[PDB]
Symmetry: D2
Subunit: 489 residues, 4 copies
Amino acid sequence: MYSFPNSFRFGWSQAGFQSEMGTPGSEDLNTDWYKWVHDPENMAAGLVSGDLPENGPGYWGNYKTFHNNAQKMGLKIARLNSEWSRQFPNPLPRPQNFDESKQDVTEVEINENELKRLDEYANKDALNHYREIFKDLKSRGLYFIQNMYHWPLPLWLHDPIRVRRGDFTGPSGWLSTRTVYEFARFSAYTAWKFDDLVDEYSTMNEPNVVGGLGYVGVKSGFPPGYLSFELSRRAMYNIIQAHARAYDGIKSVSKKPVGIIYANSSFQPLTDKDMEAVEMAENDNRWWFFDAIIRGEITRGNEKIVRDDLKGRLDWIGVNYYTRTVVKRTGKGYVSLGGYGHGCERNSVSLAGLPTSDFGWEFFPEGLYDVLTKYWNRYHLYMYVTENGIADDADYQRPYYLVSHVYQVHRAINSGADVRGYLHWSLADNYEWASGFSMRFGLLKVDYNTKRLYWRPSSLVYREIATNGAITDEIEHLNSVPPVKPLRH
Amino acid sequence: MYSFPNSFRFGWSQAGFQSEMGTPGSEDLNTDWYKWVHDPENMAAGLVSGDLPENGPGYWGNYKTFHNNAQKMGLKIARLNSEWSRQFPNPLPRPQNFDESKQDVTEVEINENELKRLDEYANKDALNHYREIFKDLKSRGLYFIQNMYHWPLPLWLHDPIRVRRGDFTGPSGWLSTRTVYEFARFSAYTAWKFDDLVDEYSTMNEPNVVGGLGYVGVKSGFPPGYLSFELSRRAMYNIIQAHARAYDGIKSVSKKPVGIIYANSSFQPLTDKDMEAVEMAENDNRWWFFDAIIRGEITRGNEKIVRDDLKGRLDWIGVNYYTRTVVKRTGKGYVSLGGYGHGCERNSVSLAGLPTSDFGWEFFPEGLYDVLTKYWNRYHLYMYVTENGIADDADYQRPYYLVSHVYQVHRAINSGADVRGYLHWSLADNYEWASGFSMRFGLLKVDYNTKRLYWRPSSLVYREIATNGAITDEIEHLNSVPPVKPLRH
Amino acid sequence: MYSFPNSFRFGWSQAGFQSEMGTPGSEDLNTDWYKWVHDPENMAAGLVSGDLPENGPGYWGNYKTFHNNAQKMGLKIARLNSEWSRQFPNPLPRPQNFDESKQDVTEVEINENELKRLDEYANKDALNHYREIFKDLKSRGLYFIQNMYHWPLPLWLHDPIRVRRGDFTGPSGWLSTRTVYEFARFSAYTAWKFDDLVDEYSTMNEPNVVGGLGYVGVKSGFPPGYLSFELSRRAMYNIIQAHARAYDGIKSVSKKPVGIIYANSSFQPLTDKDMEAVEMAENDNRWWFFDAIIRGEITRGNEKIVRDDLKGRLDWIGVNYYTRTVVKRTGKGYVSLGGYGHGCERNSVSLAGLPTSDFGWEFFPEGLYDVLTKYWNRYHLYMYVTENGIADDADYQRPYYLVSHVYQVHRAINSGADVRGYLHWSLADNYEWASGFSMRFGLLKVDYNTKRLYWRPSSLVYREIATNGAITDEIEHLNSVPPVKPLRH
Amino acid sequence: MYSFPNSFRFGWSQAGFQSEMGTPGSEDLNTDWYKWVHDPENMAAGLVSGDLPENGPGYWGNYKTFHNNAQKMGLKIARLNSEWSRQFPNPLPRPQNFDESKQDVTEVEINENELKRLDEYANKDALNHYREIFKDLKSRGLYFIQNMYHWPLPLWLHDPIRVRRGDFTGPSGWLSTRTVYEFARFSAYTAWKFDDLVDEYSTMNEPNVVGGLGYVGVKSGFPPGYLSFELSRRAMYNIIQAHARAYDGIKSVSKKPVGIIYANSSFQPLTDKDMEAVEMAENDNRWWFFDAIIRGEITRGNEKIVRDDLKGRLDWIGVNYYTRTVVKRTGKGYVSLGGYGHGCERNSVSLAGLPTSDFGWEFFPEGLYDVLTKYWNRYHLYMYVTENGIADDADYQRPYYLVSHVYQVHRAINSGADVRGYLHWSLADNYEWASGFSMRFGLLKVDYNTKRLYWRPSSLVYREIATNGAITDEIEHLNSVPPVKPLRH
């Protein structure tokens, strides 16, 4: 049988922007993302689906129903985030004792007096409502991982349209150290007010996707959608500093563990002679970032420095895994291959013959074992599988996907990796950014009209796993690939 | 919400030949079906799959595991049958006072003395084992419907190969009134020995398929596989008498309800101008048979008669429903159309765009409401949905199929139809006659190697229904058609 | 480039029963096949499609249109057959000096006097019409291969329904040596009257399918449809004698070449360790038959004899190839595998990923090279590819199928095999026996309403090949597998 | 039968950038498009396929082979374009007495002296080579339509990367009246040097796609890929002036007809109550542009004006049609619907059940009739179907697509529309802009390795049409929808 450690917890992850809106009074118009998906030109260009967040699941108002269902499903841990924009919707006076021309931000002064003054600008209603949501979460015995940032930035810090047009004279988001500075303070502020409810903290969610899709993969429809290798590096550099500064800010107010959540992929060799391509890919997509916030090894400009203000700023690693990424060696570097991992046809099969989701992502459980063990053997920091799921409205593949990946986590634990939990990507369907509501990742189906929640069969399977703290014998057969004969090719 | 009457029971149906064998010591070689699927010529011709019953689920030895799982699933009723061949594997002496040339069998003398003498020929081991299986079933609080016949006939009463070759000088099964005579006695015998364990009786299962596929739809690979419209009528005539005589035999020993289980289909009009074709189909496939055993109206030779010995021989009706049958008025009468109901492509879509099972059967829940109400408004006899299910190894459609048809039963009850239960076709996969083991109808998947049982997600859904005696709000969304976009076309 | 020998001819094959009827006055009701496809029970059982020959292409009346199109397509050879039933629709007096109980038919006396008397029973109208059709064929410069038999037998020699019912007291077709006797005389008669128009003769078409599907593969819907391994052997034994006797009969009246047309398949090993299974399959499906009519080695009863009256009765071999047959070694024998060759899903892909036709036959050109070379290396008799084609109404695969197989014939010639021609299976769509008109093999599409013919693109491709006597550079790319991405899976 | 007017010509269209390169010495690196598809960031973002023009069909060196094949196919007309960049690869001195700040360009002085001086900057080698290509075209009796511009702009007039980055201080292509000015001169220059070879002129190809995809549909990967409704209008305004000025320039040197080629779509109503949506779409996508260059009615800034310098600048209309565009009325205006026309899944079926191409475009022949008649009834200017084709490497649908649309042209002529020719989009496969070489529109398949050309079956069908100047009876059946059952869904 496949039983998990006694302290191991099964739960779910969720994002504010993707799930909060939907109920009357929940509208939040002050984020770059909100403006971004409402933009006429982005819609016309098809960069965004046309669906609007205002028509979401309504977690902001129906959180009790969400939590109650999670409880009935036997979940014991949850990771959510606070929307910076709801806390500080209005512009903060330009901070002094700060030079924006300075490339590095080695420290941000945070003390009670600063927090007290910052508190005067905060939206108490939003702050109080969050406390209510989290109190309900905790009163139900659920372990709580508080994440500080999940993509949207308050508009007074980033006007995505301005930047998309090539105008860099306004709020430029992660392109400005002003954002780094304010994020550190913001993180400290939240921890200062919610520490009594939080068990573990996370500074941000998938920072690599933010800078990657925002400035390079512009067809993905992510803000500011300005194509530039150089600005992408600047964004990633600043987000790395932001993390470190946020880590110190939180630690000034709390003793709780502080980690980060990253977007992962299992790099697989097309051929047995592509092993070196894998390592290269792992360095460019994984190691460089973590060696920076753990080893303090970073590269600003064209020199390989080691910043002490960055070294050791991490207590745990949040692993977000969905599928693999096949690569091939090409003289100089390497290349990712279409028809595998994230680059497949929707509701079809990959070049390898494995079923793909409604999003066109290939079914590849083993990849999760690879990533977990890889992270463990390199840094030996404990971790949580903070995200794992599948866009599958019909629920044809989710049962197999759920059981298979949970099994891989079990396998990684037996190899010695310290994995303390598994959080399925979402309890209920939500807003899939540029893709809209059509991509449904929930264990619970959402009727966007009534906002009513339904239990997909896989949620009943998950209840068995959470409830028994193991993959029971009766559902072991689901640790396999969804049969492709009955599915679309 | 969709709640069922307090006395309403949810369970499953199962056949001896399809599920019993598989464990050591369970072999039963004395049936026409056993010889039929082992026949070299039938295999060569592809009339039978090649799979053998001896390699089945092993219910004969693992019944306790079956029953325990049904209990855990919240099931409260079960319908099984005893294999005539196991009870009387050896030839019984030709009955005296019996004229096989006589066309009608208006009565069979059954009294304790006859039963006592019959008992001397019975296989006590098989009889005792059945009692153990049924005692275990009852000790678990499950209501029990005892069916007397489910297709296989003991070899001493029918050599299928002989008949298939055109030789009618040997045991000819339902072509001989000798079979009718012995069946009545057999039924009385079983009721005489198991009445203390039985709640309700059924004489036979799908007699229409036996005579229909056996003598007309010969490509189906059913014994004796001899093509003849005339012999098909003779077979159906005798099976009708057998039912009536078996009904009287059982009633001589019991006061319990005695019904019959029939293979049904919902006849749908291709066009709004095919209404008359539907009625014609219903008369030729349904009404003629039941008007015979209920109204006593039958037609022998070419004369329309009314036999008093046939009138009123039925207490309840067992409805076996899987899909619809579309018909059109044509040159002469009417015609069934391929590309609909049972005549579709496997793992595809029908001409109407509805998903088809691994068996090529079209998804059509409404048809069940049609059949139930049709039966009710004509005879007003209470009934059980004795069979409903789908060949779906992957379990992609079963969740939708299960909830949708259960909903239709609820809808029929609200129309006033007296339906007392729903028995899903099989708890676990089994031997699908000429098709072999490839067609898996179970809520539980069977590993034919280890004989181990696994819970498909739909069995977890069924547990919710059985346990709550209703389609709970959380799974209501399953009362819909399986999305076809992700499925094969 | 791929050019063929100067004397090599490109043309087509066609059958009387499949193409003749369709025009007024062409009805031929005196064959076992005609009665067979009109039989009410066969239709009800689904053994036959329900389509009727009377509604065919109408070659009997529109032959000139057929021939003219073949001419425009550059074809220079044609193989057709005369329908025995049209010549002798009425029963002939039983032979005086013939003992039907005798197992062997080592000789049939044929002399001018016999022919003169036989001629008195012949239908001169049918005979004269055939002469007109063939004269038109020859006047157009087309080489002519005259085939004597293509399945249907006159009713006075075979009542298929009687036999199907197990009654062997009437005309039993190939189960009677009377049929063998009459066939020899018939063949001699036709050669005696058409020798001036014929270039080369063929005794029969696919005798192996006749005996194989008629008495073993009964689900195929071929007469008499009586399942019996033993009677299948008797049928094949008699058909073998019939061939030999027909060969001698023709040779008594002609000096022209006399061969036979056989149904072939390329036996492929599932694994590299199934080589012995291939040889076994080749012996049971090919060699046994030809070693009989060439080497005179046959097996009657259970002894391996060598009949001198059978030895050397063959001048050339007609190869009918459509697809492969994958086999695996099992126990002491072997087994054909579904999902390959003829046993695939319609309009899909095989287990090997190769596209399948409207008939469910797998695309496998190489198999033709295998069969041609196999035959050559064993007997060294020259041959014609008398049949090759595909059921493809849309014409999506025919272009690739045509060019690919023609290429394989070129490849076999370069290996040294003496192949003198390629006859595509049919100029125009026709009646596919039990399958009806739905399976369209024509280069020309037939509108069964108007009987009008249309040129599918592949017929334009074929014109290039015939016209240039080679696969021109411009169409070489068609020597490949039809792309499967755009096709159905 | 469907015969065309005696003067009606069948041929093909082709673009320089898409077909010229491929042979050694044919490289043209001086265009915005060349730089655009070689850009590292565009490749990384996936805006461009990664395929490079340098690896094309090689028309620049193999034109004789192209022309010879067109001749063999019976084609009698061809429309090609000269690449501005090849003629004037180097920067021309700024125009004195020209004010770039001026919004309108009502006239450009063109006289022999100006042309003489311009000629000194021209690349004689390229000019001479073009003359050779065109002389070969004419010596084969092919009617010749000379198009002046087909998207790529010389780099000294447009640096797409600069603009994409938001920098508008450099060569801005159609955003600068300098480009308009130079285009008029360029057009006059070419006509001045090639008039003896030209039969009819076209100023530009699909100007609407240039401005539309270049500044609005940025996900299409077209230069400069800068999202801006406003700059899109400016670009279209300038391109409209450019046309008018080019028309006058050419007319100063020639008496030949001068038209324009536009990208068309047939706007279809989703419902019978969406008729007004169609008209609105037609105004926004068609009428506004043509009323400008024909009626002189244009709107600069926001002022609706009527410029006499624009009025009457058109002799004929080039219709480029591929598929429909379904629209629905929506309160204010209207909306195009995905799942129809250009917005479908690749190698699938549309929401209407019609087959889609390798490019995801829906099969809709009728739309061509709609567009032709619409244009005729409004302006009564004769036209040519300058483009019609399908991305179909396998050639499964092209035969039906070709015959069906040609039939629609015949139908439009019988309605009274003056259509003088049909030019299938490309003789051979070529570079599909941002999509690369994967989208193959050719009647002839190109092996990009050997640069060898192959005849797809549809080219044989086209030869029948061109050769007979009509859809012959034998191929009439192709005037239908490609069967979807065998195709992918």
